[PDB]
Amino acid sequence: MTDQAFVTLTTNDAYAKGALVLGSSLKQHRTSRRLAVLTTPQVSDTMRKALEIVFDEVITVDILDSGDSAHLTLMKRPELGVTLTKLHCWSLTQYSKCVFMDADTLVLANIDDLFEREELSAAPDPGWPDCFNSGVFVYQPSVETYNQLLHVASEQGSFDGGDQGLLNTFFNSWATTDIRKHLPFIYNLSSISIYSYLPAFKAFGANAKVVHFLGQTKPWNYTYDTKTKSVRSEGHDPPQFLNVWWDIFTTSVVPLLQ
Amino acid sequence: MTDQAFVTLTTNDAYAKGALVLGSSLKQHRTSRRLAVLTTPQVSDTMRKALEIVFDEVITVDILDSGDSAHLTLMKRPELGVTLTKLHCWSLTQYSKCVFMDADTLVLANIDDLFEREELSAAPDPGWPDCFNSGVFVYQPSVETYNQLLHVASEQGSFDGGDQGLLNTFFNSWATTDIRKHLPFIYNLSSISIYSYLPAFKAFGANAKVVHFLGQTKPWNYTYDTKTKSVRSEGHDPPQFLNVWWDIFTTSVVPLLQ
Ligand SMILES: O=c1ccn([C@@H]2O[C@H](COP(=O)(O)OP(=O)(O)O)[C@@H](O)[C@H]2O)c(=O)[nH]1
Numbered sequence: 440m441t442d443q444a445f446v447t448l449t450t451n452d453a454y455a456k457g458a459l460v461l462g463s464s465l466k467q468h469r470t471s472r473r474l475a476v477l478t479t480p481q482v483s484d485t486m487r488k489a490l491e492i493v494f495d496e497v498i499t500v501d502i503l504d505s506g507d508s509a510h511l512t513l514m515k516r517p518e519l520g521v522t523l524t525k526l527h528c529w530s531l532t533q534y535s536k537c538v539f540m541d542a543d544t545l546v547l548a549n550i551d552d553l554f555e556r557e558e559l560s561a562a563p564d565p566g567w568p569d570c571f572n573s574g575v576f577v578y579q580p581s582v583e584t585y586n587q588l589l590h591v592a593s594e595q596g597s598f599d600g601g602d603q604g605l606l607n608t609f610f611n612s613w614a615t616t617d618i619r620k621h622l623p624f625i626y627n628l629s630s631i632s633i634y635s636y637l638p639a640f641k642a643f644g645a646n647a648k649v650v651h652f653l654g655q656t657k658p659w660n661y662t663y664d665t666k667t668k669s670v671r672s673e674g675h676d677p678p679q680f681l682n683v684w685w686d687i688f689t690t691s692v693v694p695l696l697q
Numbered sequence: 698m699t700d701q702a703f704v705t706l707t708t709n710d711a712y713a714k715g716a717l718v719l720g721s722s723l724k725q726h727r728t729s730r731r732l733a734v735l736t737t738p739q740v741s742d743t744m745r746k747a748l749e750i751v752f753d754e755v756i757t758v759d760i761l762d763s764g765d766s767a768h769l770t771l772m773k774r775p776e777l778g779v780t781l782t783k784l785h786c787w788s789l790t791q792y793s794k795c796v797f798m799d800a801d802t803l804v805l806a807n808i809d810d811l812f813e814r815e816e817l818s819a820a821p822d823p824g825w826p827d828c829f830n831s832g833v834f835v836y837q838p839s840v841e842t843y844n845q846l847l848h849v850a851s852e853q854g855s856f857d858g859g860d861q862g863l864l865n866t867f868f869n870s871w872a873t874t875d876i877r878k879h880l881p882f883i884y885n886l887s888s889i890s891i892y893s894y895l896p897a898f899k900a901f902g903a904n905a906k907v908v909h910f911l912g913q914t915k916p917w918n919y920t921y922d923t924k925t926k927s928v929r930s931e932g933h934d935p936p937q938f939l940n941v942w943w944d945i946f947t948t949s950v951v952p953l954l955q
Pocket residue numbers: 447448449450451454521525540541542543544574652653654655
C-alpha cells in the first residue's frame with residue numbers, strides 16, 4: 440500500500456524525538472501504510488539520519504527560501520511559520536490519502552482503519568467541541584486544496600495563531616455536516632482532558648488508540664528514571680501515558696540515537 | 698403553543714434560585730413555549746410559591762414515597778436519588794416535545810428553535826466530547842422511554858454516578874449517528890471551558906445562547922455586591938456570566954422573593 444501514508448512534522452530536535460517515538464509506535468502496531476515526515480533545515484544532521492531510519496520518506500521543507508510556494512505568505516504573517524510548514528502535507532501528491540499526526544502523539548493500537556474516512560476527518564477538540572483538533576486528521580493531498588489554504592491564511596490568518604484555527608476556518612462545515620467526518624475521541628485522546636470528566640475516562644479510556652500530548656508541556660520536557668521505569672516527579676512538579684511514551688523512547692529510540 | 702415546554706428540576710432551595718433565574722431568562726427572551734419545573738417536598742413553601750409565579754406549571758415529585766414509579770429503583774441504587782427525580786421529565790406526557798434544562802443554566806438569546814430537533818438532541822461535553830452533556834437536551838415524553846431508563850438505571854446504574862452517565866449509556870448512538878442530534882456548543886456553553894481553548898471562546902463566544910454553570914461551584918455560591926454590580930472576589934477566591942446571572946437574580950428574582 441505505497442499510496443497511503445501517515446504524515447508528521449518537526450521543525451527542530453525537540454519535536455524530532457516525538458516524531459521518532461510516533462514513528463516507532465506506528466511500526467510497533469504493524470501499519471501497512473507508509474510513514475512520511477516533513478522536516479526543516481533547522482533539524483540536526485543526527486536527528487535527520489535517525490528519522491531516515493524510522494520513516495519511509497523524509498521531506499525537507501524550507502519556507503525561509505524565496506522558492507518555496509508558501510514563502511510570500513510568511514512575509515505577511517511572520518507568526519505563521521510552523522503553521523505554513525505543516526500545510527505542506529497537502530503538497531504530498533505522491534500519496535492519495537494521508538493521515539496527518541502531530542509529532543506530540545503516540546499510537547497505542549493499529550489505526551489503519553482511519554483510511555476509510557474522507558477529507559476532512561478529525562476528532563472533536565475538548566474545551567471547544569465544535570472545533571476539531573488538528574492533531575490527527577484524514578486528508579487528501581492536492582495542490583488546489585493547498586493553495587486555497589495558503590489563501591485563507593493570507594486573507595484572514597488564524598483565530599488561534601496556529602494551524603488548528605486555520606484548518607477549522609477553511610473546513611467550517613465539520614461541526615454540522617456529516618457525522619462520518621467526526622473521528623471518535625479515542626483516535627485523538629487529549630492527555631490533559633483525563634481530569635475534566637474523569638468518570639468518562641475510566642469508562643472509555645481503556646479503548647484509547649491515540650494519545651495526544653496537547654498543550655505547553657511535552658513528553659520530552661520531563662526526565663525519565665530508567666531504573667524505576669517512570670517519569671520523574673520531583674521538586675515543584677505538578678502518568679501511564681508519559682511512561683508509554685518514554686518506554687518506547689528508551690527501548691526503541693535511544694539505541695538508534697546519537 | 699401549549700404542547701411544547703422547557704423543563705427543569707430543583708430538589709432544594711439552592712437550585713431553586715437557579716431555576717427561578719432560568720425561568721426569568723426564558724421569559725426575558727420571549728419564549729412561546731411553556732415553562733415547567735419538577736420539584737420535591739424538600740423545596741420550601743416560599744420557594745414553591747416563587748416558582749408558581751415564574752413557571753407555567755409546577756410538578757411535585759416524591760420518590761421517597763412507595764407510590765412513585767421510580768421508588769423501588771432507588772432502594773437498589775440509594776445514590777441515584779436526584780438522577781431518578783430528573784428522569785421524570787419523560788413522565789410529562791401532557792407535553793409532546795420538551796427541552797430539559799439544568800437549574801444551573803441561563804438563557805442569553807431566544808432558543809425556541811431547539812424545538813425543531815428530535816429526541817435526543819444534545820451538545821458535546823467538554824473533556825469527553827463523544828458524550829453529550831445532559832444539561833440541555835431535546836426529548837419526547839413517553840412512559841415507555843421512561844420505564845426503559847428506569848430499567849437501564851437498575852440493571853447497570855451510571856458510569857458517573859449521576860444522570861449524564863445514565864442518559865449517555867441509553868442513547869449511546871449519539872456519538873456516531875446523525876449529526877442533526879448534535880446541538881451546537883453555543884446551546885450549552887460550559888462556563889469552565891472558557892479557558893481550556895480560550896482562542897475559540899474569543900472567536901465564537903459572543904454567539905453564546907446558553908451558559909451552563911457546570912461543576913462544583915454554582916452562581917448562588919458567590920456573593921454579589923449590588924453597588925458595584927459584580928460578583929465579589931475577595932479573600933482566597935480563585936466573570937461576565939456570573940454577573941448576568943446575578944443581574945437577573947437581583948432585578949427580577951429578589952423583588953418577588955421572600
Ligand atoms: O516549534 C514547533 C511547534 C510545532 N511543531 C509541529 O507542529 C505540531 C503542532 O504543534 P503542537 O503539537 O506544539 O500543538 P498543540 O497540540 O500542543 O497545540 C507539533 O506536533 C509538531 O509536529 C514543530 O515541528 N515545531
